[PDB]
Amino acid sequence: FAYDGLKRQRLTEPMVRNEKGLLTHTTWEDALSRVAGMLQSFQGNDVAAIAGGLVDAEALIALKDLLNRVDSDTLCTEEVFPTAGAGTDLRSNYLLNTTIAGVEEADVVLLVGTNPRFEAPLFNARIRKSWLHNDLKVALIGSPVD
Amino acid sequence: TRDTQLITVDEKLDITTITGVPEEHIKTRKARIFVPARNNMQSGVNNTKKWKMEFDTRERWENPLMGWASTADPLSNLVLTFSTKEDAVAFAEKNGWSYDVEERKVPKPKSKSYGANFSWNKRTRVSTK
Amino acid sequence: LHHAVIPHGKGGRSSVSGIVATVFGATGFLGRYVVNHLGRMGSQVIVPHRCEPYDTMHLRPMGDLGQIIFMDWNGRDKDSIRRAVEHSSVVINLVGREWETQNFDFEDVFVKIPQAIAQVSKEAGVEKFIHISHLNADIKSSSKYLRSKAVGEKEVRETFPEATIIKPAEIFGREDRFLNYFANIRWFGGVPLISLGKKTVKQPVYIVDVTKGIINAIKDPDARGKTFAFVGPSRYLLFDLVQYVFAVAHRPFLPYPLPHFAYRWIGRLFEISPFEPWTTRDKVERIHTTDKILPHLPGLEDLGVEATPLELKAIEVLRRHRTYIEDVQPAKTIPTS
Amino acid sequence: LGLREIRIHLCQRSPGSQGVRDFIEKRYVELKKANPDLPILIRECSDVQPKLWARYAFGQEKNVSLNNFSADQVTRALENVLSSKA
Amino acid sequence: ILPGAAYTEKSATYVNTEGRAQQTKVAVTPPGLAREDWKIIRALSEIAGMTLPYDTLDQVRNRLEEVSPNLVRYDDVEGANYFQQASELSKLVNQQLLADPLVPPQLTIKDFYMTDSISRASQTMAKCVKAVTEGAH
Amino acid sequence: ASTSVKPIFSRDMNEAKRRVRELYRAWYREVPNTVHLFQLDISVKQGRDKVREMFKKNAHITDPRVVDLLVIKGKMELEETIKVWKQRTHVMRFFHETEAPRPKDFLSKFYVGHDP
Amino acid sequence: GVRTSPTGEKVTHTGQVYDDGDYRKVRFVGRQKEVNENFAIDLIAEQPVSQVGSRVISCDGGGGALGHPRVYINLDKETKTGTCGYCGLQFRQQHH
Amino acid sequence: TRPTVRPRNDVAHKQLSAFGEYVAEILPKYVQQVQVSCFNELEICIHPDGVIPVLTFLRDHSNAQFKSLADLTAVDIPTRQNRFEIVYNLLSLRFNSRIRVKTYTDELTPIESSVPVYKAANWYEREIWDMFGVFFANHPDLRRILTDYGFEGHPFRKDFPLSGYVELRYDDEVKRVVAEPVELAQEFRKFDLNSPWEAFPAYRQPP
Ligand SMILES: NC(=O)C1=CN([C@@H]2O[C@H](COP(=O)(O)OP(=O)(O)OC[C@H]3O[C@@H](n4cnc5c(N)ncnc54)[C@H](OP(=O)(O)O)[C@@H]3O)[C@@H](O)[C@H]2O)C=CC1
Ligand SMILES: [Zn+2]
Strands H111-112 and H136-137: parallel
8 A C-beta contact, residue C237 and residue C200: yes
8 A C-beta contact, residue E12 and residue A58: yes
- Rounded Cα distance between D34 and H30, Å, is 79
- CA–centroid distance, C189 to ligand 2, in Å, is 88
Give a three-class secondary structure readout of chain A. CHHHHHHCCCCCCCEEECCCCCEEECCHHHHHHHHHHHHHCCCHHHCCEEECCCCCHHHHHHHHHHHHHCCCCCEEECCCCCCCCCCCCEHHHCCCCCCCHHHHHCCEEEEECCCHHHHCHHHHHHHHHHHHHCCCEEEEECCCCC
- Rounded Cα distance between C99 and C101, Å, is 7
Give a three-class secondary structure readout of C34-62. HHHHHHHCCCEEEEEECCCHHHHHHHHHH
Ligand nearest to the CA of G91: 2
- Rounded Cα distance between D47 and D10, Å, is 8
Cross-strand pairs, H45: H33, H102
- Rounded Cα distance between B63 and H184, Å, is 9
- Rounded Cα distance between H128 and H126, Å, is 5
For residue C6, the chain A residues in CB contact (below 8 A) are 12-13
- CA–centroid distance, C233 to ligand 1, in Å, is 24
Q: Using the Cα atoms of residue D19, residue D21, residue D24 and residue D25 in order, give the sign of their dihedral.
A: negative
Q: H81 — contact with chain F (CB < 8 Å)?
A: no
C131-to-C91, C165, C203, E10, G48 alpha-carbon distances in Å: 8, 5, 21, 44, 65
Say how many residues make up chain D.
86
Strands D3-10 and D51-56: antiparallel
Size of interface E-F (CB pairs under 8 A): 17
- Rounded Cα distance between C311 and C333, Å, is 11
Return all residues near A120 (Cβ < 8 A) that are at least 6 apart: E17
- Rounded Cα distance between E24 and F83, Å, is 54
- Rounded Cα distance between C174 and C314, Å, is 9
Q: C87 — contact with chain B (CB < 8 Å)?
A: no
Rounded (to 5) percent helix, strand, coil in chain F:
60, 0, 40
- Rounded Cα distance between C237 and C303, Å, is 27
H and G in touch (3+ CB pairs within 8 angstroms):
no
> Closest residue (by CA) to atom 37 of ligand 1?
C27
Q: Which residues line ligand 1 (CB under 6 A)?
A: C 25, 27-31, 50-51, 75, 94-97, 104, 109, 132, 134, 168, 170-171, 178
Q: Which of residues 72-101 of A touch F (CB under 8 A)?
A: none
* Resolved by: cryo-EM
- Rounded Cα distance between B33 and E61, Å, is 19
Query: Cα distance from A98 to chain F (closest Cα, Å)?
Result: 40
> Chains with 3 or more CB pairs closer than 8 angstroms to B?
A, C, E, F, H
> Closest residue (by CA) to atom 39 of ligand 1?
C51
8 A C-beta contact, residue E79 and residue E73: no
Ligand 1 atom at shortest distance from the alpha carbon of C30:
13
Residue G7, Ramachandran bin (φ over 0: left; ψ between -120 and 50: alpha; else beta): alpha
C149 burial via Cβ count (<10 Å: 0-12, 13-18, 19+):
buried
Instruction: Determine the distance from the C-alpha atom of residue C106 to the mean position of all C-alpha atoms in its chain, rounded to a whole number.
Output: 15
Residue whose C-alpha is closest to residue H118's, from H85, H146, H90, H87: H90
Size of interface B-F (CB pairs under 8 A): 44
For chain F, domain boundaries: 1-116
Q: F44 — contact with chain B (CB < 8 Å)?
A: no
- Rounded Cα distance between H110 and H48, Å, is 9
- Rounded Cα distance between F12 and B66, Å, is 57
Ligand 1 atom at shortest distance from the alpha carbon of C171:
3
Ligand 1 atom at shortest distance from the alpha carbon of C55:
37
For chain D, domain boundaries: 1-86
Helices (H), C111-206: 113-123, 144-159, 179-185
Amino acid F42 reads: I
Instruction: Determine the distance from the C-alpha atom of residue C57 to the mean position of all C-alpha atoms in its chain, rounded to a whole number.
Output: 21
Cross-strand pairs, B34: B52
Query: Cα distance from D52 to chain A (closest Cα, Å)?
Result: 14
Q: F69 — contact with chain H (CB < 8 Å)?
A: yes
> Closest residue (by CA) to atom 16 of ligand 1?
C28
Instruction: Count CB atoms within 10 A of the CB of residue D24.
Output: 24
Q: Which of C34, C71, C77, C97 best tests ligand 1's pocket when mutated (most atoms within 8 Å of CB)? A: C97
Query: Cα distance from C33 to chain H (closest Cα, Å)?
Result: 6
- Rounded Cα distance between C93 and G24, Å, is 22
CB contact under 8 A, A89 and D39: yes
Give a three-class secondary structure readout of B67-120. CCEEECCCCCCCCEEECCHHHHHHHHHHCCCEEEECCCCCCCCCCCCCHHHHCC
8 A C-beta contact, residue B65 and residue H185: yes
8 A C-beta contact, residue C69 and residue B65: no
- The partner residue sitting opposite C71, judged by closest CB among G23, G25, G30, is G30
8 A C-beta contact, residue C99 and residue C60: no
- Rounded Cα distance between F43 and H178, Å, is 20
Residue whose C-alpha is closest to residue D26's, from E85, H205, C8: E85
> Closest residue (by CA) to atom 48 of ligand 1?
C170
8 A C-beta contact, residue C216 and residue C152: no
CB contact under 8 A, C62 and H172: yes
- Rounded Cα distance between D39 and A68, Å, is 14
Using N-to-C axis directions, what is the helix angle for H10-26 and H51-60, rounded to 10°? Answer: 120
Q: Using the Cα atoms of residue C126, residue C138, residue C297 and residue C177 in order, give the sign of their dihedral.
A: positive
For residue C13, the chain H residues in CB contact (below 8 A) are 169, 180, 183
CB contact under 8 A, E67 and D25: no
Q: How many helices (H) and strands (E) does chain E have?
A: 5, 2
Ligand 1 atom at shortest distance from the alpha carbon of C172:
3
Q: SS3 for H100?
A: strand
Residue whose C-alpha is closest to residue H184's, from H206, H199, H162: H162
Residue of A47, A69, A75, A90 to mutate, testing the D interface (most D Cβ within 10 Å of its Cβ): A90
For residue C6, the chain E residues in CB contact (below 8 A) are 32-33
- Rounded Cα distance between D8 and E63, Å, is 15
* Numbered residues of chain E with Cβ closer than 8 Å to any chain C Cβ: 32-33
Residue whose C-alpha is closest to residue C29's, from C170, C154, C229: C170
Q: Which of residues 25-84 of B touch E (CB under 8 A)?
A: 32, 56-60
- CA–centroid distance, C107 to ligand 1, in Å, is 14
Q: A57 — contact with chain E (CB < 8 Å)?
A: yes
Residue A46, Ramachandran bin (φ over 0: left; ψ between -120 and 50: alpha; else beta): alpha
For residue F111, the chain A residues in CB contact (below 8 A) are 27-29
- Rounded Cα distance between A70 and C172, Å, is 54
> How many Cα atoms are found within 13 Å in the side-chain-facing hemisphere of C298?
17
8 A C-beta contact, residue F41 and residue C316: yes
- CA–centroid distance, C31 to ligand 1, in Å, is 8
Longest dimension (CA), chain H: 71
- The partner residue sitting opposite B8, judged by closest CB among F3, F73, F114, is F3
Q: For D48-64, b where at least 16 C-beta lie within 10 A, e where not — what string?
A: bebbbbbbbbebebeee
- Rounded Cα distance between A78 and C128, Å, is 45
- Rounded Cα distance between G48 and G63, Å, is 18
8 A C-beta contact, residue A111 and residue D64: no
Q: G23 — contact with chain C (CB < 8 Å)?
A: yes
- Rounded Cα distance between B7 and F16, Å, is 13
8 A C-beta contact, residue C34 and residue C214: yes
CB contact under 8 A, H169 and C58: no
